[PDB]
Amino acid sequence: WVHQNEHVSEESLDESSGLKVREVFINVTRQQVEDFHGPEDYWCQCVAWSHLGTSKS
Amino acid sequence: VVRRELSCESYPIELRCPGTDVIMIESANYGRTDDKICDSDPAQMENIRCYLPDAYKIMSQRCNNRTQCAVVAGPDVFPDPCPGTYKYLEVQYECVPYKVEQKVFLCPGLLKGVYQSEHLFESDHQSGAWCKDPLQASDKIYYMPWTPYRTDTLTEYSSKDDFIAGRPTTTYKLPHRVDGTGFVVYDGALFFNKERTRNIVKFDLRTRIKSGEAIIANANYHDTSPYRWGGKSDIDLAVDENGLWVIYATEQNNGKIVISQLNPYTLRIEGTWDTAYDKRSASNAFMICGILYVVKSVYEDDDNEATGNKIDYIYNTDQSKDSLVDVPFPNSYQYIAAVDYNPRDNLLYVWNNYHVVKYSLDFGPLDG
Amino acid sequence: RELSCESYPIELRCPGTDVIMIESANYGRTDDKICDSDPAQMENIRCYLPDAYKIMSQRCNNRTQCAVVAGPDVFPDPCPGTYKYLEVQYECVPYKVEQKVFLCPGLLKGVYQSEHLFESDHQSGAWCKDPLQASDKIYYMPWTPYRTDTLTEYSSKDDFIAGRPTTTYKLPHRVDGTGFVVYDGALFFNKERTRNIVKFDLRTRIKSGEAIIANANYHDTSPYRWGGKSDIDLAVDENGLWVIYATEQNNGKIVISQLNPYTLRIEGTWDTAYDKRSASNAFMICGILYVVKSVYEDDDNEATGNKIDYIYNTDQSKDSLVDVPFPNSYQYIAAVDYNPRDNLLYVWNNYHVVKYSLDFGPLDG
Ligand SMILES: *[C@@H]1O[C@H](CO)[C@@H](O)[C@H](O)[C@H]1NC(C)=O
Ligand SMILES: *[C@@H]1O[C@H](CO)[C@@H](O)[C@H](O)[C@H]1NC(C)=O
Ligand SMILES: *[C@@H]1O[C@H](CO)[C@@H](O)[C@H](O)[C@H]1NC(C)=O
Ligand SMILES: [Ca+2]
Ligand SMILES: [Ca+2]
Ligand code: NA
Ligand code: NA
């Protein structure tokens, strides 16, 4: 998981249907990638919360 | 005579001394110090101060004590320090006489017999592993007892006296959970198997940071193909005269032991060998100058087994041939956890049912 | 020592600032178990190339590092259908070089008359000396249309004036024009009704090769102002062997190309602005072309000539208009060749066999 402070949330409303939309942005620096010494390429995934469950991107 | 050799990225370098003279490296760097020397894109130039200290260690292992040398300056021989930067190899070398030392790097011979040498103490844990760094000339002892789903720390001891008395110098907090007893220390860096993965993690003890993570292809992991006692000992690491080794098993070889040489810098497979011995049937294994030694032994839970405590199989990497042996192995206790060979002292660093012991070796000149 | 099979480049390097010095070199086959190929190509174990030392000395010697591609680009094939290799024995010595002989004398400042030997029976012809071999031997070839087929050798200068020849070579083909030259005991000449240069070794008295000069005009198509099938002219200087000719691609203008004396291949092509038929003759010095414009017998309302009016540099690929006065006592200038060993011009002018002295500039850049 990425720290809460790194996340920048946006509380938006859609035109097609009157429902709560959420948009989150996270900055990734060169220093983060070049200092990462894992087996695979520096990857990221998105997890969203609802009253029924969760979904991965 | 002092020389200078330069070659850009993916361009192989050539080193040759006149007559029968030997090459001797003094200073080596793989990266970028000057921008106008190499010719490439201007974006990579005038922006990076790239350095690689391990450059000297790599060149000394290949070019030194040899007449001619050819090293491909790429990811096959040199690990990438700064990504997205066109690198080069700067080497300063001198020509000196050909005469080289004996029995230092050299193989002491074929194993003739294993005898009991030292008994340090009786640890709180039944399983675990202990070893020393054979590259660095120090009396430092690295200790790591195995706790299922909880192993995440390595303990360092100043001397043999402190290890028995239980006086530790420092404890390292590892970035990942460790699987099985299979682990070693190679030139101030720790190599281990990460929990629920077929990956080897490199952790520099000096900087206390992870430097790399290598995937051992098709290797069975997490109690799939461990030793007789089990305990997630699916992947075992070994150190000998030839270098760093990985003892494991693949489903392609039908659970049989697969041995692969690993580069301690680039973290890549530099050769793969398939044996006839099943890993689960074996108790532990060790490498001595390119030769695998498979230990078959009895356990406390075994109801009078026809399997005596002896080394019954050997595999040579250079010859790619195997033989059935019968060397007597110490059986004082019944739960053999780990067996590691140290090329500096030519002894076995063993863990047998809570007990931490050292075994003396008898070598025969059977090599030719 | 260094060894490399066919099409495999060889590398030579001395420690520090030391220079490479070749002792023995051979391109062929002496041993069959060294290289690894088909056994049919290894059946012949007696292939030799003497010129191997001459090639290696011109490229590797007096240098710190050397890279020579052991193939047809640098080495001519001695035995066909045989997998060859390069055997070189070399020693590391100080970085010292030998002066004056190989080195450029500078830029031409003025041409003056030097020697007058005799008045030959033929109006047009060509004479020269081999600058590579340290000998006082004079090579003579008086041009006779549709009949030139012999090269005369003279022991010394005294014998050449007195008309006392040593030996006469019977050439395998008819020669076109007065453009011939001699390079290291071998004769290079333009074969009649062809754009080809023929190599003929004087020692063995046999033809060693025949090279095709691409797009070159031949047989009175684009000769010098006097004609006489002068279409292709050969030159020798500090840079090596050269071919002065003309192509229809350059619209009759002079095209200069460097030729390898062993591989017989074009190692570079340069196009000039001067028309060959407007030119009387041309010569090479330090890789710089000098165009001669002279006056001839039968020149209606004409006096313009006896000058060097154009120059072309190969290294810089730039041209300039000069005005160096050229001597023309007799009108019909037939041949002008430069000898880098003596730094003199070998001229044939309306029956007269003359040697011209040269004066050079303080610098060349
Ligand atoms: C971090 O991301 C925010 C948008 O979520 C952006 O406005 C900000 O400039 C970024 N930080 C930097 C240093 O660019
Ligand atoms: C190899 O070369 C190194 C470079 O000095 C030298 O220290 C070493 O003793 C030589 N021999 C061996 C076995 O490493
Ligand atoms: C170069 O090397 C050759 C080989 O012997 C030597 O004869 C010559 O004098 C040297 N110097 C020059 C300028 O060629
Ligand atoms: Ca082991
Ligand atoms: Ca000429
Ligand atoms: Na181990
Ligand atoms: Na000529």
Q: What is the rounded CA–CA span in Å between residue C128 and residue C153?
A: 10
Task: Give me the DSSP letters along B244-299.
Answer: EEEEEEBTTTTTEEEEEEE-TTT--EEEEEEEEEETTT-SEEEEETTEEEEEE---
Residue C361 phi/psi, 5° resolution?
-70, 155
Which chain B residues have a beta carbon less than 8 Å from that of C92? 18
Label residues B157-179 b or e (16+ Cβ within 10 Å = b).
beeeebbeeeeeeeeeebebbbb
Q: What would the two tokens of residue B33 be? A: 């110090």
Alpha helices in chain C (DSSP H): 52-59, 157-162
Cβ distance of B213 and A34 shorter than 8 Å: no
> Which residues, in sequence order, are bridge partners of residue C157?
none
- For residue B104, the tally of other CB atoms under 10 A from its CB is 9
Shortest alpha-carbon distance between residue B106 and chain C (Å): 30
Q: What is the rounded CA–CA span in Å between residue B30 and residue C34?
A: 36
The reply, when asked if residue B104 is annotated as ligand binding, is: no
Residue B164 phi/psi, 5° resolution?
-70, -45
Q: What would the two tokens of residue B95 be? A: 């020509």
User: How close are the terminal C-alpha atoms of chain A, in Å?
Assistant: 14
Q: Find out whether C261 and C185 touch, Cβ atoms under 8 Å.
A: no
Label residues B134-151 b or e (16+ Cβ within 10 Å = b).
beeeeebbbbbbbeeeeb
Cβ distance of B18 and C16 shorter than 8 Å: no
Residue nearest (by alpha carbon) to ligand 3 atom 9? C98
- Cβ contact C–A (≥3 pairs, < 8 Å): no
Ligand 2 pocket residue status of B60, Cβ below 6 Å: yes
- C197 Cβ contact list (under 8 Å, min separation 6): C188, C189, C190, C191, C210, C211, C213, C232, C234, C243, C259, C264
Q: What would the two tokens of residue C299 be? A: 């020149």
Cβ distance of A39 and B199 shorter than 8 Å: yes
Q: What is the rounded CA–CA span in Å between residue B329 and residue B311?
A: 7
Torsion angle in degrees (nearest 10) through CA of C221, C225, C230, C232? -80
Q: What is the rounded CA–CA span in Å between residue B212 and residue B202?
A: 5
Chain B nearest-CA residue for A39: B213
Alpha helices in chain B (DSSP H): 55-62, 160-165
- For residue B284, the tally of other CB atoms under 10 A from its CB is 28
Size of interface A-B (CB pairs under 8 A): 13
- B197 Cβ contact list (under 8 Å, min separation 6): B179, B221, B222
Chain C nearest-CA residue for B19: C1
Q: What is the rounded CA–CA span in Å between residue B265 and residue B244?
A: 10
Identify which of B360, B353, B289, B339 has the alpha carbon closest to the alpha carbon of residue B131: B339
Length of chain C: 365
Q: What would the two tokens of residue B106 be? A: 């050299």
CA angle B93, B96, B102 (to 5 degrees): 110
Q: What is the rounded CA–CA span in Å between residue B24 and residue B2?
A: 10
Torsion angle in degrees (nearest 10) through CA of C109, C115, C116, C121? -80
Q: Go through the domains of chain C in sequence order and give each one's CATH number.
A: 1-101 (2.60.120.740), 102-365 (no CATH)
Q: What is the rounded CA–CA span in Å between residue B299 and residue B284?
A: 13
Optimal mutation site among B1, B22, B67, interface C, most CBs of chain C within 10 A: B1
* Ligand 2 atom, smallest distance to B106 CA: 13
- Determine the distance separating the centroid of ligand 7 and the alpha carbon of C137, expressed in angstroms: 16
- Determine the distance separating the centroid of ligand 2 and the alpha carbon of B90, expressed in angstroms: 20
Instruction: State which of A6, A8, A22 you would mutate to test the pocket of ligand 1, scoring each by most atoms of that ligand within 8 A of its C-beta.
Output: A8
Measure Cα distances from B21 to B97, B99, C23, C93, C295 in Å: 5, 9, 20, 16, 67
Overall resolution, Å: 3.4
Which chain B residues have a beta carbon less than 8 Å from that of A39? 199, 213-215
Q: What is the rounded CA–CA span in Å between residue C72 and residue C262?
A: 10
Q: What would the two tokens of residue C90 be? A: 């070399």
Q: What is the rounded CA–CA span in Å between residue C8 and residue B147?
A: 59
Chain B nearest-CA residue for C89: B19
Type of residue found at B266? T
- Name the DSSP letter for residue C224: B
Helix, strand or coil, per DSSP, at residue B104: coil
Cβ distance of B215 and A34 shorter than 8 Å: no
Helix, strand or coil, per DSSP, at residue C113: strand
Largest CA distance in chain A: 44
- C6 Cβ contact list (under 8 Å, min separation 6): C35, C70, C71, C83, C84, C85
Residue nearest (by alpha carbon) to ligand 2 atom 9? B101
In this structure, the strands spanning C253-259 and C241-246 are antiparallel
Ligand 3 pocket residue status of C58, Cβ below 6 Å: no
* Ligand 1 atom, smallest distance to A25 CA: 5
- Closest ligand to C281 CA? 5
Q: Find out whether C12 and C66 touch, Cβ atoms under 8 Å.
A: yes
- Closest ligand to B24 CA? 2
> Which of A33, A34, A37 faces B213 most closely, judged by CB atoms?
A37
- Cβ contact B–A (≥3 pairs, < 8 Å): yes
Q: Exposed, middle or buried, C150 (CB in 10 Å: 0-12/13-18/19+)?
A: middle
The position carrying tokens 């000719």 is C245
In this structure, the strands spanning B199-204 and B189-194 are antiparallel
- Determine the distance separating the centroid of ligand 2 and the alpha carbon of B57, expressed in angstroms: 11
Identify which of B343, B317, B368 has the alpha carbon closest to the alpha carbon of residue B104: B343
Q: What would the two tokens of residue C311 be? A: 């120059």
Q: How was this structure determined?
A: X-ray
- Name the DSSP letter for residue B58: H
Residue C162 phi/psi, 5° resolution?
-70, -15
Interface contact C13, partner B, CB < 8 A: yes
Which chain B residues have a beta carbon less than 8 Å from that of C15? 1, 3, 17-18, 95
Q: What is the rounded CA–CA span in Å between residue C208 and residue C198?
A: 8
Measure Cα distances from B322 to B63, B275, B294, B308, C169 in Å: 31, 8, 11, 20, 75
Cβ distance of B17 and C15 shorter than 8 Å: yes
Chain center to CA of B74: 22
- Determine the distance separating the centroid of ligand 2 and the alpha carbon of B64, expressed in angstroms: 7
